[PDB]
Design an enzyme around this catalytic site. Structure first.
Site, mmCIF file in Angstrom:
data_model
loop_
_atom_site.group_PDB
_atom_site.id
_atom_site.type_symbol
_atom_site.label_atom_id
_atom_site.label_comp_id
_atom_site.label_asym_id
_atom_site.label_seq_id
_atom_site.Cartn_x
_atom_site.Cartn_y
_atom_site.Cartn_z
ATOM 1 N N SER A 1 -21.855 66.261 73.827
ATOM 2 C CA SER A 1 -21.240 66.244 72.507
ATOM 3 C C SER A 1 -21.180 64.807 72.016
ATOM 4 O O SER A 1 -20.634 63.936 72.701
ATOM 5 C CB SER A 1 -19.834 66.855 72.540
ATOM 6 O OG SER A 1 -19.242 66.842 71.252
ATOM 7 N N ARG A 2 -21.742 64.560 70.831
ATOM 8 C CA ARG A 2 -21.742 63.207 70.286
ATOM 9 C C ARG A 2 -20.333 62.763 69.913
ATOM 10 O O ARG A 2 -19.944 61.621 70.185
ATOM 11 C CB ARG A 2 -22.663 63.135 69.068
ATOM 12 C CG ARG A 2 -24.121 63.458 69.366
ATOM 13 C CD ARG A 2 -24.734 62.459 70.334
ATOM 14 N NE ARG A 2 -26.175 62.651 70.475
ATOM 15 C CZ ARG A 2 -27.091 62.114 69.675
ATOM 16 N NH1 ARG A 2 -26.729 61.342 68.658
ATOM 17 N NH2 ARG A 2 -28.378 62.352 69.891
ATOM 18 N N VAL A 3 -19.555 63.650 69.289
ATOM 19 C CA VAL A 3 -18.184 63.305 68.920
ATOM 20 C C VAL A 3 -17.373 62.974 70.166
ATOM 21 O O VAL A 3 -16.636 61.981 70.207
ATOM 22 C CB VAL A 3 -17.541 64.448 68.115
ATOM 23 C CG1 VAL A 3 -16.134 64.065 67.681
ATOM 24 C CG2 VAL A 3 -18.398 64.797 66.905
#
Lengths: 275, 123, 27, 134, 68, 182, 91
Positions: F130-132
């Protein structure tokens, strides 16, 4: 080039390298115990009977100094396979010393690989062997010393071939020379410098013979068992290394085949779209 | 080669041919594991196949007269009778005791033995 | 060059030998 | 030729207790015939100790050892160079005797000429060990 | 007795120590119990002639005797 | 089949523009490219890799790029996208997978082998990313989540020696047992 | 055999005889891979004297192909495995 087949063979090498890498860990774990057991049991009563016998001056004066014409070889090898090249070396040396002259050695092997490897080259020479040793301990090594004592009466000398665990990565083959019971008793009865009256000489001669034999046997097993795990760990390291190199090479060919596949299919689509 | 059949050529030549093919073929089926791990852990009967296969493989090579400038050694012309006899003795286990190096770039089996025997004499 | 077949045969081979003796004990 | 004041070596196939020691002042053990005492200048001689007690005096207290042990059987050799070596099958302290745990299934024996002496020794140790605790 | 056990019977010294401890193996700590263990295998070596397992170690199994 | 993703996406923008939060799930998104490829090939357009048109990448970009988090000025609404992709041989090296992965932030890779072993949901945490990251998690989850990720990371490295549990020394088999609990 | 033309022909015909280059050079001529070869008609074509013997023949050869790997393992061989291994070698 049939990417499906290449990717399958790459998977096989991956599992081999995995299990090969795992056995290396176990090889190191077991080597640690053997080293701990060896350092604690090593040099246990070794050379004691030899030292005092040398201290016996009157014995040396009357010591029957002759060359044994017939000897008994008891090579020590590991039973589990894929342990390294230590087994090949032991069976190789005994093979040389035995192939040279036949009918002068009983060749009672120890270990599955040692006995199995010497069954075909030397049939009718080796009649029995010891294998499936649950654990290494002096009571067991004494039982082995007894079996050799029974079969040693026919031969004028007894010697053991085994690996010497000098370093974690260096195991050198070392062979001890032990005289049989008959020669030992006749030589021991002349002992006069060291008094033996608590047990009478007729009993002390036979008892100290076991100590003389079991000590060498018990010491050899530890050296060979430690060399097994040491040689096994190195074998898995070299095997896992080769497994990784080959797996990486196929990965390159897999990518090359992947590009050719896209090129082949892409040209087909363009050929149909052209018309 | 379509010419390879027991009826066209002498039956002996056919047997020696299959002996080498079967030897190398069996050895080829083991090259995989030989790469991952050495031949020490390999079975005895299988080690013999591997060992003898190397000797035959090295003996197959020979210098050419035209390629004398490349390698720098004189070429060799192997007669048919010498060819069959050379490999026949090798398959039986004649030059197995000698190192595989003495069979490298040799014309006849007897030539390799002379080199292999000399290598054993110096040492 | 087929190592997957080598592992596959080794699996079935040793298993058969191992369970072949177990069959004797079971009988 | 000759050696220093003395050196004693107590070894066990599974552990080494004293590779070489000089602080000890005296050693006493029980042989088949009678009890002996090995100390400095003791002449050269061989002995075979049954599974009896082994007591050794220390001038300076040694760690992890009490000086009073019960061995299961061993060989003793006093070399010509004023040196004695004790090698026993196994060694333990009296405090770990755990008495009253004997005869827990191994009472059965075979009526043979060898089994008679076999039980003879086993019974002797039981009688010995009971006294060794005291 | 240790002397007559070997004279009138083929009982080695080691076997005598084993039979001696046999009655007190449970009394001794587990450390010594694991040490007093003999388990191996002996084969008369043809392709498949014989396979003998040596586990008793006290009777005429590992250290034979004339009395047995 | 080609318009449905955009049709549903327009319905989500209604909630996004009005400040509301919406969730849109594109099931069998890969089939959309096949539908667009069909129209492209039947129209005799120049085919590209795997017979897909040159703008196959642009097809999905303009679609997913409309799902975003509007600021408080427009209302603060949001539109979450969850496109689905079906890999034939689990190879993400194909044409369409590389496009959707390069456009999307993260990808949740599901393995079939884990499903057989009984790991339901068969989520492969190794590839899943997940980038976030923790920025999305709540303050309560951030802390325990960080330590959890590290424990699983070390377990997967030692998982290669799971079968050899008792053979290996101490302090390592215990880590394997702990990972089994997680 | 994963190519386009061979795959189609296999699906059209009833049975197929697989020839192996390895078996050919190892002295197995005709080099026939019985593990993959198959026929729809099966024993329906064989004669009575053949079906009876053909049945057990397939089973015996099946076991031999499995123990082939253990030969490399070696270091021991059970009495029965030695027989089955030898028996299959005769076939």
């Amino acid at each position: 080039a049939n990417l499906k087949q290449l990717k399958i063979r790459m998977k096989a090498i991956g599992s081999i390298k995995k299990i090969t890498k795992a056995m290396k860990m176990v090889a190191a774990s077991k080597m640690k115990a053997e080293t701990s057991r060896l350092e604690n049991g090593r040099n246990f009563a070794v050379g004691s009977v030899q030292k005092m016998l040398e201290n016996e001056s009157y014995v040396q004066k009357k010591k029957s100094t002759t060359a044994p014409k017939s000897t008994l070889l008891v090579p020590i090898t590991s039973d589990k396979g894929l342990c390294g090249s230590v087994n090949s070396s032991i069976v190789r040396e005994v093979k040389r010393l035995a192939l040279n002259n036949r009918s002068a050695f009983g060749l009672l092997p120890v270990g599955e690989k040692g006995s199995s490897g010497l069954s075909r080259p030397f049939p009718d020479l080796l009649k029995s062997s010891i294998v499936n040793i649950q654990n290494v301990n002096f009571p067991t090594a004494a039982a082995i010393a007894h079996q050799v004592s029974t079969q040693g009466a026919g031969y004028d000398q007894v010697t053991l071939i085994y690996n010497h665990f000098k370093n974690a990565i260096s195991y050198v083959v070392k062979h001890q020379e032990l005289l049989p019971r008959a020669q030992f008793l006749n030589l021991f009865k002349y002992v006069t410098r060291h008094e033996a009256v608590e047990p009478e000489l007729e009993y002390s001669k036979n008892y100290f013979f076991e100590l003389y034999m079991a000590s060498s046997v018990y010491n050899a097993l530890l050296n060979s068992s430690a060399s097994e795990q040491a040689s096994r760990m190195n074998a898995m390291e070299n095997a896992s290394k080769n497994a990784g190199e080959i797996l990486s090479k196929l990965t390159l060919d897999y990518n090359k085949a992947r590009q050719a596949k896209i090129t082949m299919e892409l040209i087909e689509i363009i050929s149909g779209a052209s018309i | 080669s379509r010419m390879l059949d027991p009826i066209t050529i002498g039956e002996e030549h056919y047997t020696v041919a299959r002996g080498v093919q079967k030897l190398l073929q069996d050895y080829k089926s083991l090259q995989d594991i030989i790469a991952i791990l050495g031949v020490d852990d390999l079975s005895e009967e299988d080690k013999l196949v591997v060992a003898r296969a190397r000797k035959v493989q090295k003996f197959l090579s020979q210098p050419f007269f035209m390629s004398e400038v490349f390698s720098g050694i004189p070429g060799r012309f192997v007669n048919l009778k010498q060819n069959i006899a050379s490999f026949k003795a090798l398959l039986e286990g004649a030059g197995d005791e000698y190192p595989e190096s003495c069979f490298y770039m040799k014309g006849d089996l007897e030539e390799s033995l002379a080199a292999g025997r000399a290598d054993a004499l110096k040492s | 060059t087929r190592e997957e077949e080598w592992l596959d045969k080794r699996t079935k081979s040793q298993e058969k030998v191992y369970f072949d003796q177990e069959d004797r004990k079971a009988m | 030729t000759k050696k220093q004041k003395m050196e004693v070596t107590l070894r066990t196939p599974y552990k080494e207790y004293l590779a070489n020691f000089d602080g000890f002042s005296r050693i006493t053990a029980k042989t088949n015939e009678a009890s002996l005492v090995i100390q400095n200048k003791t002449p050269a001689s061989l002995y075979v100790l049954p599974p009896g007690p082994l007591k050794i005096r220390f001038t300076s207290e040694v760690k992890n050892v009490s000086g009073d042990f019960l061995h299961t059987g061993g060989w003793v050799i006093v070399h010509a160079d004023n040196t004695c070596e004790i090698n026993v099958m196994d060694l333990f302290d009296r405090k770990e005797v755990r008495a009253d745990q004997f005869e827990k299934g191994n009472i059965q024996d075979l009526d043979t000429l060898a089994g008679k002496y076999a039980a003879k020794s086993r019974k002797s140790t039981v009688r010995l060990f009971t006294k060794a605790t005291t | 007795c240790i002397e007559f056990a070997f004279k009138k019977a083929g009982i080695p010294i080691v076997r005598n120590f084993l039979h001696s401890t046999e009655g007190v193996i449970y009394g001794l700590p587990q450390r010594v119990q694991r040490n007093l263990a003999i388990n191996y295998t002996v084969k008369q070596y043809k392709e498949g002639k014989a396979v003998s397992a040596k586990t008793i170690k006290t009777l005429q199994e590992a250290f034979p005797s004339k009395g047995d | 089949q080609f318009l449905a993703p955009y049709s549903g996406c327009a319905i989500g923008e209604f909630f996004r523009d009005n400040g509301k939060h919406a969730l849109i799930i594109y099931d069998d998104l890969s089939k959309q490219a096949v539908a667009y490829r069909q129209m492209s090939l039947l129209l005799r357009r120049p085919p590209g890799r795997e017979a897909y048109p040159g703008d196959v990448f642009y097809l999905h970009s303009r679609l997913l790029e409309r799902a975003a988090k509007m600021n408080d000025s427009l209302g603060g609404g949001s539109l979450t996208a969850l496109p689905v992709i079906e890999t034939q041989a689990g190879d993400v090296s194909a044409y369409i997978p590389t496009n959707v992965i390069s456009i999307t932030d993260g990808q949740i890779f599901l393995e079939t082998e884990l499903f057989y072993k009984g790991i339901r949901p068969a989520i492969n945490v190794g590839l899943s990313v997940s980038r976030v990251g923790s920025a999305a998690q709540i303050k309560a989850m951030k802390k325990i989540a960080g330590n959890l990720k590290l424990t699983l990371a070390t377990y997967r490295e030692l998982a290669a020696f799971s079968q050899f549990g008792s053979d290996l020394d101490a302090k390592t088999q215990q880590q394997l047992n702990t990972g089994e609990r997680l």
